Amino acid sequence: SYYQRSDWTADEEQILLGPFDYLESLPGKNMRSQLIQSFNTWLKVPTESLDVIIKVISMLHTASLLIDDIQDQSILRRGQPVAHSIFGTAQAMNSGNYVYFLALREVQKLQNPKAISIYVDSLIDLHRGQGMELFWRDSLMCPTEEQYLDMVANKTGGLFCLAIQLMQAEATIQVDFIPLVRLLGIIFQICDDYLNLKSTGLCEDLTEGKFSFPIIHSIRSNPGNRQLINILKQKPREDDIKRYALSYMESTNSFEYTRGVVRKLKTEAIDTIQGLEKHGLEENIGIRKILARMSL
Amino acid sequence: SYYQRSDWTADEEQILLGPFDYLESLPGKNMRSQLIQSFNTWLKVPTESLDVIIKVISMLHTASLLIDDIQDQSILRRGQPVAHSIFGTAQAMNSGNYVYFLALREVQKLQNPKAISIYVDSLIDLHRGQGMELFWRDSLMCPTEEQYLDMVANKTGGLFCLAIQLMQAEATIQVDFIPLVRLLGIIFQICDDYLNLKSTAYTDNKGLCEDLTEGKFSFPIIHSIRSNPGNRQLINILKQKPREDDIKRYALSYMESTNSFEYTRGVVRKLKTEAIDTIQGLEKHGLEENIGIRKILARMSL
Amino acid sequence: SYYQRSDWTADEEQILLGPFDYLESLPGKNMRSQLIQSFNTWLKVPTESLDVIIKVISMLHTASLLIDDIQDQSILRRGQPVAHSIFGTAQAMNSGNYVYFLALREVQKLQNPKAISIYVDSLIDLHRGQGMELFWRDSLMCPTEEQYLDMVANKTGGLFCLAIQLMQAEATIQVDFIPLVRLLGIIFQICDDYLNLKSTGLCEDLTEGKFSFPIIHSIRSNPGNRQLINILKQKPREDDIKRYALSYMESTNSFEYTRGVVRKLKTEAIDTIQGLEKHGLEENIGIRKILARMSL
Amino acid sequence: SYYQRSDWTADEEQILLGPFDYLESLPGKNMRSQLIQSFNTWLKVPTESLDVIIKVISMLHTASLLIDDIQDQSILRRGQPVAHSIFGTAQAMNSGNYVYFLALREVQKLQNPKAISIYVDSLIDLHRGQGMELFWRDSLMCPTEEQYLDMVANKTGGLFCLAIQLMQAEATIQVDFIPLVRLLGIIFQICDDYLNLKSTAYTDNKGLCEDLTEGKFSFPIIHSIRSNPGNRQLINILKQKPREDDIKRYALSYMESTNSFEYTRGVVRKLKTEAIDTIQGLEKHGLEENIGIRKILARMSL
Amino acid sequence: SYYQRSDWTADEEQILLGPFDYLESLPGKNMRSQLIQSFNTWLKVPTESLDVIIKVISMLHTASLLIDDIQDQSILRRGQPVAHSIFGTAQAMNSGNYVYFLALREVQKLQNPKAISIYVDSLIDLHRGQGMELFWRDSLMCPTEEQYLDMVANKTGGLFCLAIQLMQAEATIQVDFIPLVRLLGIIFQICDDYLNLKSTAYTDNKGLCEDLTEGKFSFPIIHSIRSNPGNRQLINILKQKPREDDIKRYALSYMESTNSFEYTRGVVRKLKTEAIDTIQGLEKHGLEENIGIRKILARMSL
Amino acid sequence: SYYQRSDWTADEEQILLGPFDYLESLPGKNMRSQLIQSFNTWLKVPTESLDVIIKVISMLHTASLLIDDIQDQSILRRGQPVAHSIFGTAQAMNSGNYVYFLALREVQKLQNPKAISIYVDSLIDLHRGQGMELFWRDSLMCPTEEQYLDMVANKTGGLFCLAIQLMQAEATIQVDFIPLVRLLGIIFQICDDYLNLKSTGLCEDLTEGKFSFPIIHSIRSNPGNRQLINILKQKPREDDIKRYALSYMESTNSFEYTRGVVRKLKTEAIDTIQGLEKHGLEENIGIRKILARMSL
């Protein structure tokens, strides 16, 4: 009687989604979507469910950008200012975790008894990946390549795998695509690492102190030289430190090593793609295109 | 194959849970699990289900402390360092949101279909309340008391309501206890606001007037700001996020001049009366007299 | 006997006027002066007094730059470093307030019983304007256009009006020019706001968190979007935040809105100028030129 | 018309005066209005004029505290937060200079033509003294004692001299009291310098040795620096602007080793003797014996 | 000629030595010059040579405090400000390395050719130990206890060993005392590590647990970190370099739970027993019983 | 028995010399070496000793760069990032002071009874010079030209003189070259000061607050203007402050004054060089080349 509970208003949603709406208004390379499209060539998910899945994955992806940019302490995002440099850390963080749960509500629309478990297991894999990455960063402990790949499997596989698993759960065909999906996420992340250092901020991964795939190679290629790992500790904003690091990683042949690893991995994926097709699946051009987009 | 997927190990769980386990080992008031037990006098949920519910609510509560101490830039927690000042904010944040989803997995063990929707709706309300509170905070706009209470109902209420709705989902009695529990969450939050400013117990556990340092528009702060809009001293103090004891001291003195601490006591007094009436009303409809719930209401007092 | 009061020396003046002499040595757009010249076409102030007034207004103008640059936390001034980044905050502040009172001593040379009251009322209007502007800035409270204009009347009218009022007090003609003078100061300030965002630091008003005329328009044009007002709170030094804000203000048509307001205001001034001339005043080319200088 | 000029409102005055009103409500020593009253025994200015003078001098004094606390980067004021740490420096600064001109308007009410020139010359001296003090401060050059006293005569003296010159302008007696009042302002400032370092009353009101934190070349600091130029410890401490109590403590200890606090007492002793002689001299020329002025001199003592 | 070379003056020495002289005037424990005197019972170095040795070792010790307080970012030293917080780091650093070479010049006065090589080898060991300690520090890698003891032998041991090797070079007795003195330097450093955390005497002289603020992997810290690798709380605290007393307090509490302070006492106990055996062994070979050396061993104790 | 002293390993040397090895891997203008070569035309030091001396001087020079960059708070070094911005202050400092003593061990290889005294006296002169320079900087006390030159004699003469003195101590000829060596170091330092402000970071000496030769001239040329010395106090990172200072030093004719001083000093050196040659020394082309390299 003294307290009268009010309904939630459009204006309040608008406030809560400010950081989220901002990010969504920035053009990006929409690739989770193309990945969904080219797996749908095989899975043929009914349209009403595919739209639900696409919206769930868009939401989760954007929400996790809000959070990752805060936790990585990035400065740019699709070339425009990072969401929390407009709205502040707290509202960006909370906006993104809010969207995690709007997405779960959206997922409930599949009215599929397995969809909740699929969502939970992905979000758990997500944070498990991002947690091991923060652990190495904060401890200055360089992982092995193998350790890095298991982490990437979790933390970039998480949403890749989430999308395809939901599609699988809504489709009639019972082929297991997840191993291939996980490969593509690993390739995607390794390419990302490479492009962050070699492509037209300058090497934001160095500023953030991240043990990325080529940085790992360079540090371990000659553990007697501690210049690179010490640069990571400094978390350098300066272009002159970054340019020096870049140059040292050239001397260790680490960009050549990464290119050859991506080559080896694309070859496994094509081989795998051909396996599924030699077993009664339509030839998939769209997925070969996706895999060509990653190349460097 | 080049990639050889591996199993998650206990050593890795331990890393992921470091911040959470740190917080979990500092002693707390356990209001929430005592509130559950008082309601279980009426709802009589079996032990197996009730352990799950208690575990889910305490996972979610610790998790959100992890996150809220970061977003509030708090310094102490249970009179000990905030988790993120040991582990850093990134890992403290990630561990906290990780646990949100460990708790979702945990509530699946009820194999109750209403349970997922209850969980979803409550996490949503949590973030809605927290989101409006940060909005006023960052914009320097003082809410009305009514707006404050709507937000508290979502933020603090959302987790009280989650605990009792899960119990209701696990019980066959068709009484709605949620209004009562929501009322208790408001009373609890207003008491918390008052104590953040007026007690050596909380001033030893979170700092002298940490709500001032954070710039939070709490219940007595709102009252004192709005009771004399021509004086901007208090809201300017909030803008400054003072760590100094002298500013906080002056602000506290100012709020006594506005009779705001008395105003709050009076409000809490009216709400607790409403709470007792509600309890007595439920009991006048077949329920046994509930001493535990009277004792938890009591232990929210000044 | 133990204390012997010493005279004030040229060397000490030189110290006290260091920040002031520095600013005066930087070329600027000298417009208070042209405004005085083109009103003198009508007022014909005797030369000895006009020189006193010109010196008083030069002093006050430069002194208030010393102070405004500190209070706004600017970084550049006429392209060169801001006075307090050479001399420090305290000496720049004190140098400027010192000059306020040297000017009052200079004003006493008019030996006009009204001149002191005119000076006091202007300096009061000055600080009243700058105080409401700090109040909105520090409180994140966006004023209305109407509120902003009353503030500008006070805080840019103050020295405009001061100059013309002294001239009026020293002249024989009794025409009231102040309403027109105040209009011109409002036009001058709105143009300044526009030029601060669209012209060749980049949008120093965003860094300073100022509710300027186009920013006000943009914020209020769509109060459901809080991106701009939140950028103001951040007080951004980064060019990427400023560029984004700039772009958002384009989308709200706020530069088009400001241009049309300045158009409307120039038309009132010409109309007013023509009124005074249709009542026995020389046709004033110089003031029409001044008003053309503001255009955008 | 598009522009519709509006009147200044009381709500707006209140904003403009927030910092000033804040300071004005913290209790002070009221040396200045007591000094005026002692001189009024001799000058016998009518109440109406004397209220104006007292109001002008207290407006100007509060205003310049607002400004000086910013320029000195002070932390406390009358044992309370500095105005700018509630209101921010911009508004605190603007409000302070605003009041300078409210006071100019206020002194116009004497309708005394000498009054404007007196006001102008004193504000000029104020800024000249403050300006030399910042110059030594920022350049790390220690003045001589003589230069220090010239600057104090302008800075602290300028506002004592303003109060008594306005009274002289409102009186027909043709005695010059300004030399005496200037002497009193020096004594007052030297006492202030000593007490900033040597008293729990001022160390509770402005902090432990706040003059050190600010880097001010005060009277005992100058003496101690110059008495042994081969030791640069003290002047290097000034350069550092220490907030830590340990540095300030060490510096205080150093200045005792230089007998600087004794040196100051001795100087203050000589000046107060000169002050009494001057008073007795004025009284030996027709003026009634002035007990009040003897009591204010007394209450400047250690 | 345009350039007219000039002589170095006492005024300039005084500047160069300001930081050094500041430190030199704060009272210390004088362990090192007492250790020299105890060994001189056996080595019986003439007074003239022994004064030189004592002067060289105390120059080098003060110099390296100057430098180590900067590199460790220490706050207090002998319960007084660190030299560089008066003089700034540049001058404090330069003065300290200056003195390293004044001491080299000073040791030349022995006109002993072994002396230069002894000096060189010890300064080398100093920097080797300090260098490994910063390496672990900055990399966040906890050494093993064995690696810690190797580093301590170089860093703290290097200056004990320097003092006694110079004495050996000035004596004709052909006994090797260096193993014993190195052992004493380890015991001394482990005691220092323990006391940095567990005594109001050292907590009043260097701060509450200043080793935590600095991130140093000291003896009990290493033990406590390594005794439970699954808990990363302590090493994460080191990473944070906490100045707050609450974090340091929690970390201290954590290390008690790991029984690390007991572990250290036990280690120090074993080393002191080894030290006594060594002494007794040397004495069983012609040397007179040495009470002084037993008393300095004693005064390293808890 | 409980403690077992371990030997020092290559891996540990590698750690301790990390900052040092880094610096040595950056190309620099190798001039201490050319100075040694062209004095060896006269001194003809036996090869085995000349190599020892060269290594000692290389070590000391690089080590003192590690330290000076920390104490000056520089940011660049031979165009690449400064050593302590990779390794941190403490390890760079300690790496450099370690090398001081490795060099002393190296010097012992000359097995020359005088070499230790020569080393000590140079290192003392070094720190005496750098100490007076920090004293003026930290006290804002502008030295006289004459004071500055005595300081430079110590702090840039120190290693110049050290090199030639060791060569002298290892050579058979007994000519005293030190006065000429000291002249060349003074010329070298004055040229350095000039080039730091006029040459293609921008005026790092202003950022560091250094009283260099032209800055000294400018400040003292008109002590009534305190703009330059106040810029020094600010230690400006901004290019706009530096550009303004640069311009003010132009107006004081201070770069013209420095060029004329260097002219006067080169003329003394040539005159001195010709003296030594008119007394039985080979004509030295190499040293005239060195002296031409300094020119501006």
Side-chain angles (χ1 to χ4, degrees), chain A residues 152-185:
Chain A
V152 162
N154 284 332
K155 80 123 186 184
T156 297
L159 273 205
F160 273 44
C161 292
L162 175 52
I164 305 310
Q165 294 212 57
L166 291 181
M167 298 177 64
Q168 260 168 213
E170 296 290 297
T172 277
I173 159 188
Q174 258 101 60
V175 172
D176 188 23
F177 297 110
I178 298 319
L180 173 66
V181 176
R182 191 162 278 119
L183 193 63
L184 299 171

Side-chain angles (χ1 to χ4, degrees), chain E residues 1-3 5-28 30-113 115-201 203-205 207-209 211-215 217-269 271-283 285-302:
Chain E
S1 181
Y2 185 12
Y3 176 55
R5 181 69 156 148
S6 298
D7 282 340
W8 193 245
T9 66
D11 290 332
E12 295 168 295
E13 256 313 78
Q14 205 182 21
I15 288 168
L16 257 283
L17 289 185
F20 173 91
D21 286 338
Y22 164 77
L23 228 56
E24 187 58 57
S25 73
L26 311 182
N30 260 317
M31 203 68 63
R32 277 164 196 85
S33 74
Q34 287 173 11
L35 191 104
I36 289 174
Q37 284 161 22
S38 297
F39 276 89
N40 203 36
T41 300
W42 290 330
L43 295 171
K44 291 169 189 301
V45 175
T47 299
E48 249 196 26
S49 295
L50 196 72
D51 297 336
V52 178
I53 297 191
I54 292 167
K55 181 165 175 161
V56 167
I57 288 320
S58 72
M59 280 166 79
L60 294 175
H61 171 66
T62 308
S64 66
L65 298 180
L66 284 180
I67 292 160
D68 287 353
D69 285 349
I70 297 160
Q71 283 177 3
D72 299 357
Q73 305 286 294
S74 315
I75 299 89
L76 293 197
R77 167 63 62 188
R78 305 182 179 163
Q80 297 300 346
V82 290
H84 53 128
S85 76
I86 293 181
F87 291 95
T89 57
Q91 287 189 65
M93 189 193 318
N94 191 66
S95 182
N97 301 133
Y98 182 51
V99 170
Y100 281 169
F101 297 102
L102 300 187
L104 177 45
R105 184 168 73 177
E106 183 70 21
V107 84
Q108 281 183 300
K109 309 186 170 183
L110 298 178
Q111 311 184 78
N112 185 322
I116 304 318
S117 292
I118 290 167
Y119 172 102
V120 171
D121 285 352
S122 302
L123 272 285
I124 283 181
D125 286 342
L126 247 193
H127 287 74
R128 288 183 174 168
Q130 181 64 341
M132 287 311 296
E133 184 154 50
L134 300 172
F135 167 70
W136 301 318
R137 218 256 330 255
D138 293 347
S139 70
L140 260 306
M141 292 310 168
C142 183
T144 69
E145 192 182 296
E146 294 67 47
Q147 290 163 320
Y148 183 68
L149 290 186
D150 285 336
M151 176 281 305
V152 169
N154 282 329
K155 181 197 157 60
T156 300
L159 226 281
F160 285 29
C161 287
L162 172 48
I164 302 318
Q165 277 184 291
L166 290 162
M167 302 178 76
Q168 293 189 162
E170 292 284 301
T172 48
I173 185 171
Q174 16 205 23
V175 187
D176 186 9
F177 300 96
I178 294 327
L180 170 61
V181 71
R182 209 177 282 289
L183 176 54
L184 291 177
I186 288 160
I187 299 165
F188 177 81
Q189 180 58 53
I190 297 185
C191 287
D192 213 56
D193 291 353
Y194 178 114
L195 291 177
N196 189 276
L197 303 179
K198 303 287 290 181
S199 87
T200 37
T203 277
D204 282 312
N205 278 304
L208 179 70
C209 294
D211 279 354
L212 291 171
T213 298
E214 314 182 332
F217 287 102
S218 71
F219 191 86
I221 298 178
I222 292 166
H223 173 270
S224 163
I225 284 173
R226 288 185 164 267
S227 62
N228 181 13
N231 189 297
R232 306 309 279 350
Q233 305 183 1
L234 185 44
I235 196 170
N236 283 305
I237 281 160
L238 282 200
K239 183 203 166 73
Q240 306 296 332
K241 286 167 201 300
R243 286 156 179 273
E244 306 74 16
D245 275 13
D246 289 316
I247 302 178
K248 304 202 267 195
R249 250 143 210 151
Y250 178 88
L252 188 58
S253 179
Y254 180 81
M255 311 185 55
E256 302 171 350
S257 90
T258 47
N259 317 315
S260 285
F261 299 107
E262 192 223 279
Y263 176 78
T264 306
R265 286 193 299 271
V267 169
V268 162
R269 207 175 296 121
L271 298 181
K272 291 173 84 157
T273 289
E274 182 169 343
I276 285 286
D277 289 355
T278 308
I279 287 158
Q280 288 172 346
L282 300 158
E283 289 171 354
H285 286 337
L287 304 175
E288 61 190 321
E289 199 191 352
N290 192 324
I291 302 311
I293 203 68
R294 288 185 174 69
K295 305 190 88 175
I296 71 192
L297 226 201
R299 106 159 190 180
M300 304 171 162
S301 70
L302 248 216

Side-chain angles (χ1 to χ4, degrees), chain F residues 79-138:
Chain F
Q80 296 289 50
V82 93
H84 58 284
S85 66
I86 294 177
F87 294 91
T89 274
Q91 280 187 90
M93 196 174 169
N94 182 265
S95 181
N97 290 307
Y98 182 50
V99 165
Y100 280 166
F101 298 102
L102 298 185
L104 187 60
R105 182 167 78 185
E106 195 66 27
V107 146
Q108 293 183 286
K109 286 175 175 171
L110 300 178
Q111 297 192 47
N112 178 320
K114 305 301 177 180
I116 302 291
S117 299
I118 288 157
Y119 167 104
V120 181
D121 290 354
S122 298
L123 270 277
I124 281 159
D125 277 358
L126 196 46
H127 295 73
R128 292 188 172 165
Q130 169 73 338
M132 288 312 295
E133 186 166 325
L134 298 165
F135 166 76
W136 299 320
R137 181 198 80 187
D138 287 351

